[PDB]
């Protein structure tokens, strides 16, 4: 199972920013112009529409992947082993891997 990591968005007030490529799995970056975000302390930006929010997101392995994961294997002819139990005459049962 994958995990989607989303870093803090870059909110450019009264201006604009540009997305750049990064070596991250399924990396997404988009600049949304005309945002006017509000925080607990009020309006974050001054300009009404000359602001941009740059959103970034990428895929990571979840914490469960250490334990909850499936292993894909290529299978080729290997070996055949057996545990053999043998007794003869007055000799009691003896066994070994062969």
């Amino acid at each position: 199972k994958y995990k989607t990591k989303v870093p803090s968005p870059v909110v450019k007030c009264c201006g604009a920013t540009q997305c750049t490529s990064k070596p991250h799995p399924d990396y997404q970056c988009q600049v949304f112009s005309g945002v006017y975000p509000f925080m607990y302390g009020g309006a974050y930006c001054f300009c009404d529409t000359e602001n941009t929010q740059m959103s970034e997101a990428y895929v990571e392995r979840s914490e469960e992947c250490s334990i909850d994961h499936a292993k894909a294997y290529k299978v080729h002819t290997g070996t055949v082993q057996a545990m053999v139990n043998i007794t003869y005459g007055s000799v009691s049962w003896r066994s070994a891997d062969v």
Binding site: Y2, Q28, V59, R61
Partner: protein, 49 residues
């Protein structure tokens, strides 16, 4: 493929090169809210299980 068994593939559980193929798409944040909304195809491993 996205939403399929192999949507997430890694050569080993500790590798630093991860293959991910999900329709991860950033959506516009809601008016006046600082957040990073996104849509993505549900995990194909969970589906497979």
């Amino acid at each position: 493929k996205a939403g399929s068994f192999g949507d997430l593939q890694s050569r080993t559980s500790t590798s630093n090169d991860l293959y991910a193929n999900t329709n991860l798409k950033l959506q516009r944040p809601q008016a006046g809210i600082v957040h990073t909304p996104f849509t993505q195809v549900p995990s194909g491993f969970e589906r497979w299980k």
